[PDB]
Amino acid sequence: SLSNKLTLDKLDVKGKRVVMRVDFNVPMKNNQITNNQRIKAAVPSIKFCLDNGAKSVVLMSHLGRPDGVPMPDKYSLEPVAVELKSLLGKDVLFLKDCVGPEVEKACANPAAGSVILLENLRFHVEEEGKGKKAEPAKIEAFRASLSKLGDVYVNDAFGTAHRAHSSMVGVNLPQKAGGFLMKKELNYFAKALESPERPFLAILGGAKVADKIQLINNMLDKVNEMIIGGGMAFTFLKVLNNMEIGTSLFDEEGAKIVKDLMSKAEKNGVKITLPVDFVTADKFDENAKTGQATVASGIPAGWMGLDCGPESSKKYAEAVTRAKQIVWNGPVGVFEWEAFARGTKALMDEVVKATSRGCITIIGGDKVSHVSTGGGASLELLEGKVLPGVDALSNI
């Protein structure tokens, strides 16, 4: 909801220093970024600021969960600065901290047009307001320091909008505006949820049932169809079909409530699509020996299902084909491992094809309508919850 919040499009930034919270919390391997989507997504906001004469843009974010200990050897934002420099065609000055005298001096009056990226906010216990306990006078000093780094604050950190952390809710500046990414994300989910195109399909995958209960319930009140996929589905199939599932994931708490989810699906007229066949593995390994199973065959003892199989992909494809809107959150298989990526890659293929014929296609965690930068924050929007990062924006 941004009708009564200040937004970047109406913020005057000419000759002003902008401190901007972003979600640059990007997947990483051996200090190489493996998905730069979250960095690219902040670009419109940054460039609007530069193009309208900001004196500076100070970007701040966390990365991973270093729990309030400075971990520059493992969870440094420095690779992001390098990546952002390409994206912008502008020098990015990387500061090895995010608060204190040195950072304050670097941000006091930078050369016109400067883009500055601070180090991981979570190197300070005062950001989360807890660590692996915070002191109010320390949290206050942390926040007072971030508040010096610009004249105006912008929150473009949609992916972190569910976290009531100091950089998200604690910044004390007269004007705190929602960025273009904040707006775009909220608009898309608001349209999808309040004015859906129909049939409305949700594809939900993931490992467990018990932590997805509220999500599933809230989705059942809005959708026409739901795919339940990923390791979750083994819980449903053991309960509903007494499928023999081997060593695959089994949610003992979620098993107890599958009856109730299906009851809600039924009274709402929601067609549930579960997988019907599987790619099995002999261990939880990328280079495990692999096989095949169906619901009817069962999964042989000692083996686990790590991807859906080809007939499940035809069934998932039936539901995609009928859809005019799709919201997909969670994997249907362990696609980080190529042997177990076919179900996900096939489903992505159908979803891309649906976008080509006019289907609204929303993915979370240009061949689709909207690739969300929010995993958890979007999961929170889908369960009907408030976003502290949005609430804390200044009102008009």
Side-chain angles (χ1 to χ4, degrees), residues 167-328:
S167 58
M168 290 308 284
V169 307
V171 179
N172 176 42
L173 290 171
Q175 284 186 296
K176 321 172 263 162
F180 299 165
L181 179 66
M182 194 71 82
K183 185 176 284 184
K184 174 169 161 64
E185 298 274 7
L186 297 169
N187 280 166
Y188 269 108
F189 290 103
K191 203 292 197 260
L193 289 170
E194 297 152 16
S195 306
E197 302 298 314
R198 291 189 185 276
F200 180 178
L201 173 70
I203 308 169
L204 304 182
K208 289 287 168 208
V209 188
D211 57 355
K212 273 165 275 254
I213 303 324
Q214 190 72 16
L215 173 73
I216 290 165
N217 275 334
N218 207 65
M219 285 306 90
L220 292 176
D221 269 322
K222 299 150 184 309
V223 294
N224 300 108
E225 297 196 54
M226 181 177 290
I227 292 162
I228 294 285
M232 202 164 30
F234 296 113
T235 296
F236 288 70
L237 292 157
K238 179 163 192 189
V239 172
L240 297 168
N241 300 69
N242 303 89
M243 172 186 187
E244 191 66 51
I245 76 179
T247 64
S248 319
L249 292 171
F250 177 66
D251 191 338
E252 212 188 336
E253 176 162 77
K256 285 179 184 139
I257 60 71
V258 162
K259 179 172 191 299
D260 305 320
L261 296 173
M262 296 308 294
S263 175
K264 181 160 186 190
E266 156 187 276
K267 70 144 165 195
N268 289 16
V270 181
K271 173 174 173 63
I272 298 289
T273 294
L274 280 161
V276 290
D277 67 347
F278 309 90
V279 181
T280 54
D282 71 334
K283 54 200 43 170
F284 183 63
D285 215 86
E286 189 179 7
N287 294 299
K289 296 159 196 323
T290 74
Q292 68 169 55
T294 57
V295 165
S297 85
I299 287 164
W303 292 65
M304 59 182 58
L306 292 192
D307 194 16
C308 73
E311 257 283 326
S312 308
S313 296
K314 298 187 187 186
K315 286 210 69 200
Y316 289 176
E318 283 162 19
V320 168
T321 288
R322 292 189 279 270
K324 304 221 199 75
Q325 177 184 294
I326 302 174
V327 170
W328 178 7

Side-chain angles (χ1 to χ4, degrees), residues 286 333-338 340-341:
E286 189 179 7
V334 201
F335 66 99
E336 289 166 339
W337 299 341
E338 193 63 50
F340 316 105

Side-chain angles (χ1 to χ4, degrees), residues 72-142:
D73 201 25
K74 188 166 159 195
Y75 286 112
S76 185
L77 287 166
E78 196 172 330
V80 184
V82 175
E83 182 75 20
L84 180 65
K85 171 171 174 176
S86 302
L87 300 173
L88 297 188
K90 211 153 186 163
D91 286 345
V92 167
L93 173 68
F94 185 62
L95 294 176
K96 296 200 20 264
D97 209 335
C98 62
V99 288
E102 274 181 58
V103 170
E104 294 173 20
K105 185 195 298 200
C107 296
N109 195 25
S114 295
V115 177
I116 294 171
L117 167 71
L118 311 184
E119 186 56 294
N120 192 336
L121 284 157
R122 276 189 199 177
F123 285 7
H124 294 272
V125 67
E126 295 75 18
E127 167 67 358
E128 301 172 82
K130 70 216 211 202
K132 311 183 80 258
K133 221 234 278 137
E135 283 277 13
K138 286 194 99 173
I139 285 158
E140 176 188 10
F142 190 77

Side-chain angles (χ1 to χ4, degrees), residues 54 152 154 195 331 370:
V152 302
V154 170
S195 306
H370 182 53

Side-chain angles (χ1 to χ4, degrees), residues 19-22 58-62 118 121 146 153 167 171:
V19 208
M20 190 175 292
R21 230 289 190 181
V22 287
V58 190
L59 295 159
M60 69 186 165
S61 170
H62 72 285
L118 311 184
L121 284 157
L146 295 183
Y153 168 89
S167 58
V171 179

